[PDB]
Amino acid sequence: KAGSAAAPFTKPFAVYKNVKFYLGDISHLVNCVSFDFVVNAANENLLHGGGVARAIDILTEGQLQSLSKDYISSNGPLKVGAGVMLECEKFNVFNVVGPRTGKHEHSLLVEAYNSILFENGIPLMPLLSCGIFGVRIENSLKALFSCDINKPLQVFVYSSNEEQAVLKFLDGL
Numbered sequence: 001k002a003g004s005a006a007a008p009f010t011k012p013f014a015v016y017k018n019v020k021f022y023l024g025d026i027s028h029l030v031n032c033v034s035f036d037f038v039v040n041a042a043n044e045n046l047l048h049g050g051g052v053a054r055a056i057d058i059l060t061e062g063q064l065q066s067l068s069k070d071y072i073s074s075n076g077p078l079k080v081g082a083g084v085m086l087e088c089e090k091f092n093v094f095n096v097v098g099p100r101t102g103k104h105e106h107s108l109l110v111e112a113y114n115s116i117l118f119e120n121g122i123p124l125m126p127l128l129s130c131g132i133f134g135v136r137i138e139n140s141l142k143a144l145f146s147c148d149i150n151k152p153l154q155v156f157v158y159s160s161n162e163e164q165a166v167l168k169f170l171d172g173l
Contacts, residue, residue, distance in 0.1 A: 007034040013163055016170050018149045022156045023163050026055045029124060030091070033154045036121025037085065040064070041128050042095040044077035052126050053095075060088040068095070081111030085119060094119050098128030101135045109135065109143030117147060124154045130162070137165040145173070 002008040010032040012020035022029055030038065040048070040056045046068035048057040057064040067086040078084060083096030096115055099108035112128050127144065129135035137157075144155075157163055 002032050008032055009034060014167055014170055016173065018151060019153045019155055021166050022154065024156055026052055026156060027059060029156055030059065033124060034122065035124035035154050037092040037094050037119060037123055039116055039123045039125030040093050040095045041126050042097055044097050046072055046095060056093055060091055063088040064093050081108045083115035094123065098133055100133045105135055106143050109140060110146050113144045113147045117149065122152045122154060126156055137162055138169055141169045
């Protein structure tokens with residue numbers, strides 16, 4: 001929930017330099033914080049049937065998936081590490097593909113986080129590759145903080161376990 005809003009804001013549970021972290025559903029947080037685009041942790045085929053992808057698709061009333069079908073028909077699956085901005089009616093959604101855990105996960109997460117950073121403006125974004133893709137949250141955080149972050153990021157996590165992982169990670173800096 002917004003504390004208030006000349007542009008919305010809410011208390012992050014942690015801040016490190018440019019990066020603010022929030023515990024919250026993206027469906028809620030799009031009304032809590034200030035951001036220029038939302039980041040969808042997408043799969044290569046831009047099939048947004050589950051997770052944060054489905055939350056964002058529902059927020060865009062199916063526009064994300066329809067724009068994604070067009071993008072795929074014209075351009076093909078996103079490369080792991082790459083992202084594409086799809087401008088929906090109410091939200092610009094940057095769809096970025098984190099790697100699955102294994103070889104090259106760090107460099108690929110770094111490419112993905114850099115693609116977010118190369119978009120204009122402030123993202124409201126999850127950490128990438130956590131959960132289903134199997135990357136340890138600590139490694140996802142490590143990749144993110146491996147990048148030159150010269151703009152504000154609004155980063156969200158869903159569980160108190162993730163929140164503790166972030167606070168522990170941040171403590172070690």
